[PDB]
C-alpha cells in the first residue's frame, strides 16, 4: 500500500511552502474519440526546494495537513 | 411512551455529571497554574488531576484520547 | 451480532429460504455479508441440503450466533466440538 506517484512541472512559488504542482494528462473525449489534453493544479509543501518556471518533481499523497495540499514529497529531478 | 421514564433518568444523570466534570476542569485548573507559579505544587496536585481524569476515565463521560490530551498536556509540561 | 439469513424469497404462496451471513439489525433482504448456502424448504424435495460450509466455516469459528429457530438444519450439519 503506497502513496501517489504523480510527476510534473510547476508554475511559480511564493513564501511559506506554496509548492503548487501543475500536472498534464491525456483523455479521450467520451464520444468523438479525439485525444484531448488537459491539466490540473495541485499543491504540496517543502522548505525552499523549488522556484518559478520549471520545477518538475514527483509528489506523493499523504494525510492532508493543509487546507488544499494533500501530497508529501518534493523529491526533485529536473529543474531550470 | 416508554420515554416518559427516560425524561428524568437522564436529568438526574447529567445533573450529577456536570458537577464532576466541573471539578474535573477545576481540578486540572490549578495544576499548570501551579507549575508556572513556582509554587509548592511541583508535586501532589498533578497526581490529583491524574486522579480526576482517571476517575472520569472510568466512566464514559470523557473519551480516552481526551484524557490522553490532559495527561499529555500536564506531565509533558514537567 | 452476526447471524444467518432465512429470508422470504421465491414465488408468493411458496416461502423459500436462502442461507447467508446476515446481521441482527439489517432486514431480511438487506445488506448481506457473505453466502452460506440455501435449503429447499418447499417440503416437496428429496435432495435439498445445500450448505457448502467451508465458505461458512469462518462464521461460527469467529463469533457467530445461531439463527432464529433454524436449528434443525443446524442439526443435519455437525460443525461443533471439532474445536
Amino acid at each position: 500500500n503506497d502513496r501517489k506517484v504523480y510527476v510534473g512541472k510547476v508554475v511559480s512559488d511564493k513564501m511559506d511552502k506554496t509548492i503548487t504542482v501543475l500536472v498534464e494528462t491525456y483523455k479521450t473525449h467520451k464520444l468523438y474519440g479525439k485525444r484531448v489534453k488537459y491539466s490540473k493544479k495541485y499543491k504540496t509543501h517543502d522548505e525552499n526546494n523549488s522556484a518559478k518556471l520549471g520545477d518538475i518533481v514527483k509528489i506523493q499523497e499523504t494525510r492532508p495537513l493543509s487546507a488544499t495540499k494533500r501530497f508529501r514529497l518534493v523529491e526533485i529531478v529536473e529543474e531550470s | 411512551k416508554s420515554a416518559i421514564k427516560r425524561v428524568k433518568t437522564t436529568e438526574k444523570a447529567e445533573a450529577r455529571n456536570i458537577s464532576q466534570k466541573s471539578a474535573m476542569r477545576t481540578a486540572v485548573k490549578n495544576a499548570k497554574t501551579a507549575v508556572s507559579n513556582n509554587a509548592d505544587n511541583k508535586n501532589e496536585l498533578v497526581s490529583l488531576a491524574v486522579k480526576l481524569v482517571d476517575k472520569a476515565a472510568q466512566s464514559n463521560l470523557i473519551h480516552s484520547n481526551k484524557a490522553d490530551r490532559i495527561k499529555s498536556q500536564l506531565m509533558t509540561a514537567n | 451480532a452476526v447471524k444467518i439469513r432465512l429470508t422470504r424469497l421465491g414465488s408468493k404462496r411458496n416461502p423459500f429460504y436462502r442461507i447467508v451471513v446476515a446481521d441482527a439489525r439489517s432486514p431480511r433482504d438487506g445488506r448481506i455479508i457473505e453466502q452460506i448456502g440455501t435449503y429447499n424448504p418447499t417440503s416437496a424435495n428429496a435432495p435439498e441440503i445445500k450448505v457448502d460450509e467451508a465458505l461458512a466455516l469462518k462464521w461460527l469459528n469467529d463469533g457467530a450466533k445461531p439463527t432464529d429457530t433454524v436449528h434443525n438444519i443446524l442439526s443435519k450439519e455437525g460443525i461443533m466440538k471439532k474445536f
Binding site: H29, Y32, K34, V36 | - | -
Partner: protein, 136 residues
C-alpha cells in the same frame, strides 16, 4: 465539420414543439405557481358559444366555445356533434387534437363528462359525441 470544432461546440438536438400547449400545467392554489404535469384531460367552465363561418376549402359554418380550464388558461375548444348541449357554465372534459381549418382551435370536448351526455338522435356512433341505448 472537422473534429476539433466538433469537440469544442458539440451537437445540439432539435427543439420539440409540442401539441396541446395549453395543458400539462397546474397553477397551484396556495403557493400560486405554474408547474408541470403531463395530464391527459382537464376540467373547465364555459363562457361563450358563437360560430364563425369561413373555412376556405371547406366552406360550411360551425360552432366553437371559449372554455377556460383549471386556473384560467383560456382556450377555444371544438364541440363534436350534429346536435349540441344546452348549458352555459359547464363542467366539460376537454380533449386534445386539432380540428383543422378553424384558425384557433386545437381542443375537443368529450361528450358526456357529467354535464350533457350528448345527442339522443344518433345510434351507430355509439361512443363518439355521446350516444346511448345500444345493446349490440
Amino acid at each position: 465539420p472537422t473534429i476539433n470544432q466538433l469537440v469544442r461546440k458539440p451537437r445540439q438536438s432539435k427543439i420539440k414543439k409540442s401539441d396541446s400547449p395549453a395543458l400539462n400545467k397546474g397553477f397551484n392554489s396556495k403557493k400560486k405557481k405554474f408547474t408541470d404535469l403531463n395530464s391527459p384531460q382537464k376540467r373547465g367552465v364555459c363562457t361563450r358559444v358563437g360560430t364563425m363561418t369561413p373555412k376556405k376549402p371547406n366552406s360550411a359554418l360551425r360552432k366553437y366555445a371559449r372554455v377556460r380550464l383549471s386556473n384560467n388558461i383560456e382556450i377555444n375548444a371544438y364541440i363534436p356533434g350534429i346536435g349540441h348541449n344546452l348549458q352555459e357554465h359547464s363542467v366539460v372534459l376537454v380533449r386534445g387534437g386539432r380540428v383543422k381549418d378553424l384558425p384557433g382551435v386545437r381542443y375537443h370536448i368529450v361528450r358526456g363528462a357529467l354535464d350533457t351526455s350528448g345527442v339522443d338522435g344518433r345510434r351507430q356512433g355509439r361512443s363518439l359525441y355521446g350516444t346511448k341505448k345500444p345493446k349490440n
